[PDB]
Design a protein around this ligand. Structure first.
Ligand SMILES: CCCCC/C=C/C/C=C/C/C=C/C/C=C/CCCC(=O)O[C@@H](COC(=O)CCCCCCCCCCCCCCCCC)COP(=O)(O)O[C@@H]1[C@H](O)[C@H](O)[C@@H](OP(=O)(O)O)[C@H](OP(=O)(O)O)[C@H]1O
Ligand code: BEF
Ligand SMILES: [Mg+2]
Length: 941
């Protein structure tokens, strides 16, 4: 009768509000313990496997992954695409209809489909397997009187667990009793500062959070999936480019159907009119045996024109370009996982970045210091002050801090140093390392037993101190604490390299406070270090702390802050001028979020944009009854930059509101960056979700698409560059392929209706469509990206792939190619003085006349791609071709293969040898394309 639904309802209500709720729902966290068969002493007294299985109805505390399949499931999933469906349907209907009493086209289309499916499946499998490479127990529980180590999987509701510093909490719990406990909830909650846990205030232990200092015992309330991490994890279970490609594919396939209908209608009408103009058929009974065969042949003639129109090489070329771009992007520490999220970042219009972890290094470090009455805005050289102050400070910081608090090297490659102990006095300890000194020998010389008296931190006075009597017969004391707490108890200060001077509270404490205000304005918390030496004779009374804690001598005041990453301020500036507006959504305090937002440049001074808290954000959107309407979100999202104190649901609500909104003129593509379990839900809804590699939890990397291995914010810009470059490469390849297809379909239409022979045989067109154009995509997608791409404004979510300038080049070069092909077909026989091959008995040697047309058609395309490298109105189409060796290599290889094919082809390729004069004439006719390119560029678009 525990009704675990109310138990998990007791969770997810962190803060002092939990204390209020448990006061009316329960007693003082001992009533709930009584509602279970447990006691604070020897909780769950009998292990009792039957009782353990009885309480196992709550959870088993284990969640395994899936690992869907090795290769078959991915292959099967890849086959369900619109483009491949129409390609395979056309292939199968062409192959089947070739036998009605064809063999080549169906096999070619099927082979292309197999190739694209295999490439996509292999790339996805390789990336998925590589992702798990970077992502690759028992603690004290009082079972029966004696505390006994037990594995994590055996934890059940009601177990009493003991927690000491350095442990990792396996399940949610309630604070029973313990010393001063501090829990780091930076990953789960998102609060930068350490949270103090006590029975009186905030007794809400959460799973998956480290414990910094203190010891205690807790009950276990939510064991497995019901825990806070489990809820988010189990909630985690059509790129923009694919939508545009599918729309283009269904628009192109629609166009060829009209042409096929035109061919069949015109030919059938011609046959009927010609037959019924000279004589009249019986019309009575002759229609059964042979009349239907004419129309079936006409239908076959129409279908063979329909087949040519659709581009059978588009999917393979797009996949090859995307694969090359993905492989080239890994050198910038971006690990794309789906192979189709490579382009989604290029046209991004908004970024929602987490504060802690992503924008900030998540480590407390000393930003600025004040030593010797000389303000230093930056960490100084140790030789700067060069006095006894350096050694005295080092000794004070080392001795006064707790010996458990220590800093350890990463002992790894490319990682930040780890901080185990209290990180409020670990940046202060790291200040010594920043001054290029050694703290460890000082502590090793004086252990605890050689420290006479220690004044531990207490609630009454926010200060900590220690006293060491070693150096001489006289005594020495060090003190560390908050700024104003110790400053008012300070009577002297050091001045540069000189001795102490009177810190009388007349205009001097006032000036010190005057320099303190900028530190508090910049968000820095102020901590000061003081010291005082005691005479040996008489022996002072340590019990009387009234006066020994006063008359201190401050040495320095240092500011402690959670600083921004070194490269964030510039990266945001670049991506903000490229049309991408940046927002900050975090679960930390509103005061801390605002201070760091200004430094990163997200919000500039002037109070132009509103910053809202999470509770107000939830309250405003809901329209009384308690449902979310898009109008309310459209009210506030256009000018909401900082969102603080947000639960994971709020982040998901915001990124859903922006995507599904038509308030603005253009549709929005939202990308979200994060590193914690908070951004689990928000990374899924985002179109492309980045995640930190070395400083990110496992849930964040499960919901991400592009993992930043080097976890540096400067690689967001390069993702934009590469996305825009991929879009440009796909645009230019489309520009090339559409001209090829238009010319081919018009030639086939003319060779079907007006004449009975087509100069381009089925075998000849296979090589041009499949082999030559596939290598022509890799030669066009290999141009190196440049920084100049970051000035173009983002494109819309619904803007068609074919721009206005691309329609000028597609139809412009179709005019030039058609006229020359037609003239070489009709009147080329007299030009070359060669015997005509216009008509054949269908069993004849390959005519030289048609080989001229085929070689001219191929040779004009080789110089069409050298022209197709400029999508915009660039006249100079030869720029940077030298910085592209693979392009020239592919062009020359294609030319040599064309020579070999045409010279040694024979019957299978419907080609005959050519004399060198005809080769030169064909090469010149091809070279005319470059000259015509300037003319076609001259016309305004
Ligand atoms: C060569 O041009 O492509 C051929 C197809 O190739 C063939 O192969 C077809 C085979 C027969 C060739 C005969 C021509 C014609 O089809 P398309 O792709 O041109 O048709 C789209 C479509 O019509 C959109 O709707 C328009 O968009 P919008 O909504 O503005 O009208 C868009 O125009 P835009 O570029 O201005 O966006 C057009 O491109
Ligand atoms: F504060 Be973040 F969401 F880790
Ligand atoms: Mg974070």
């Amino acid at each position: 009768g525990c009704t675990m639904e109310e138990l998990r309802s007791l969770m997810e209500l962190r803060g002092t509000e939990a204390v209020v709720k448990i006061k009316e729902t329960y007693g003082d966290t001992e009533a709930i313990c009584r509602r279970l068969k447990t006691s604070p002493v020897e909780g769950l007294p009998g292990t009792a496997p039957d009782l353990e299985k009885r309480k196992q109805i709550f959870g088993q505390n284990f969640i395994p992954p899936k690992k869907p399949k090795t290769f078959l499931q991915l292959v099967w999933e890849a086959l369900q695409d619109v483009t491949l469906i129409i390609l395979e349907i056309a292939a199968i209907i062409s192959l089947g209809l070739s036998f009605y009493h064809g063999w080549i086209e169906g096999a070619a289309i099927l082979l292309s489909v197999i190739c694209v499916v295999l490439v996509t499946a292999f790339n996805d499998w390789s990336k998925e397997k590589q992702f798990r490479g970077l992502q690759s127990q028992k603690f004290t529980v009082v079972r029966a009187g004696q505390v006994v180590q037990i594995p994590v999987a055996e934890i059940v509701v009601g177990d009493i667990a003991q927690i000491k510093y350095g442990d990792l909490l396996p399940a949610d719990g309630l604070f029973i009793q313990g010393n001063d406990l501090k829990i780091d909830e930076s990953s789960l909650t998102g609060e930068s500062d350490q949270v103090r846990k006590s029975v009186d205030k905030d007794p809400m232990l959460l799973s998956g959070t480290h414990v910094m200092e203190g010891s205690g015992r807790m009950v276990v309330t939510a064991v497995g999936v019901n825990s806070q991490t489990g809820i988010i994890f189990t909630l985690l279970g059509k790129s923009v480019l694919q939508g545009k490609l599918t729309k283009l594919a269904v628009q192109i396939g629609k166009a060829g159907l009209v042409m096929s209908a035109i061919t069949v209608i015109i030919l059938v009408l011609y046959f009927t009119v010609d037959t019924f103009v000279v004589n009249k058929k019986p019309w009575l009974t002759e229609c059964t045996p042979v009349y239907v065969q004419y129309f079936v042949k006409f239908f076959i003639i129409g279908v063979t024109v329909l087949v040519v129109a659709v581009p059978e090489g588009l999917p393979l070329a797009v996949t090859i370009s995307l694969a090359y771009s993905v492989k080239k992007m890994m050198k910038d520490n971006n690990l794309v996982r789906h192979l189709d999220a490579c382009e989604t970042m290029g046209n991004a219009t908004a970024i929602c970045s987490d504060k802690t972890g992503t924008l900030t290094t998540n480590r407390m470090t000393v930003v600025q210091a004040y030593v010797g009455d000389v303000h230093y805005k930056e960490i100084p050289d140790p030789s700067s002050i060069n006095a006894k102050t350096l050694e005295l400070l080092v000794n004070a910081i080392a001795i006064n801090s707790a010996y458990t608090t220590k800093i350890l090297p990463p002992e790894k490659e490319g990682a930040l140093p780890r901080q185990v102990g209290n990180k409020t006095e670990c940046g202060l300890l790291g200040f010594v390392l920043d001054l290029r000194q050694d703290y460890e020998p000082v502590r090793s010389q004086m252990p605890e037993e050689k420290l006479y008296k220690v004044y531990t931190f207490n609630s009454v006075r926010k200060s900590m101190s220690t006293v060491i009597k070693m150096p001489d017969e006289s005594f020495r004391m060090y003190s560390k604490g908050a700024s104003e707490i110790v400053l008012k108890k300070c009577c002297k200060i050091l001045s540069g390299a000189g001795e102490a001077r009177v810190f009388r509270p007349r205009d001097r404490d006032e000036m010190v406070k005057k320099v303190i205000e900028p530190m508090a304005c910049d968000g820095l918390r102020t901590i000061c270090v003081a010291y005082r030496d005691f005479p040996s004779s008489p022996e002072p009374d340590w019990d009387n702390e009234n006066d020994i804690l006063n008359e201190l001598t401050c040495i320095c005041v240092v500011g402690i802050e959670d600083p921004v990453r070194p490269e964030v301020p510039e990266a945001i500036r670049k991506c903000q001028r490229a049309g991408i507006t940046v927002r900050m959504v975090t679960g930390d305090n509103i005061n801390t979020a605002r201070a760091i937002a200004i430094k990163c440049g997200i919000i500039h001074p002037g109070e132009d944009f509103l910053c809202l808290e999470g509770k107000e954000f939830n309250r405003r959107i809901r329209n009384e009854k308690g449902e979310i309407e898009q109008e309310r979100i459209d009210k506030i999202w256009p000018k909401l930059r900082v969102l603080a104190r947000s639960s994971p649901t709020d982040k998901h609500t915001l990124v859903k509101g922006i995507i599904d909104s038509t308030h603005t003129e253009q549709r929005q593509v939202v990308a979200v960056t994060g590193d914690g379990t908070n951004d689990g839900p928000a990374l899924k809804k985002a179109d492309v979700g980045f995640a930190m590699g070395i400083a990110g939890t496992d849930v964040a990397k499960e919901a991400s698409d592009i993992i930043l291995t080097d976890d540096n914010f400067s690689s967001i810009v390069k993702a934009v560059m590469w996305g825009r470059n991929v879009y440009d490469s796909i645009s230019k390849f489309l520009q090339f392929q559409l001209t090829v297809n238009v010319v081919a379909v018009i030639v086939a239409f003319t060779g079907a209706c007006i004449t009975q022979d087509s100069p381009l045989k089925a075998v000849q067109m296979l090589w041009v469509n499949l082999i030559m154009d596939t290598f022509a995509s890799l030669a066009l997608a290999t141009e190196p990206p440049t920084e100049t791409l970051l000035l173009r404004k983002p494109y819309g979510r619904n803007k068609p792939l074919i721009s206005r300038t691309m329609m000028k080049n597609i139809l412009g070069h179709a005019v030039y190619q058609l006229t020359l092909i037609f003239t070489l077909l009709f009147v080329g026989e007299k030009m070359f003085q060669i015997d005509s091959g216009r008509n054949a008995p269908l069993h004849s040697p390959p005519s030289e006349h048609y080989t001229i047309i085929f070689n001219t058609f191929v040779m004009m395309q080789l110089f069409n791609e050298i022209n197709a490298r400029k999508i915009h109105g660039e006249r100079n189409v030869f720029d940077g071709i030298f910085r592209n060796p693979i392009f020239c290599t592919i062009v020359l290889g294609t030319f040599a293969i064309q020579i070999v094919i045409v010279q040694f082809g024979g019957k299978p390729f419907s080609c005959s040898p050519l004399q060198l004069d005809q080769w030169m004439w064909c090469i010149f006719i091809g070279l005319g394309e470059l000259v015509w390119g300037q003319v076609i560029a001259t016309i305004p678009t």
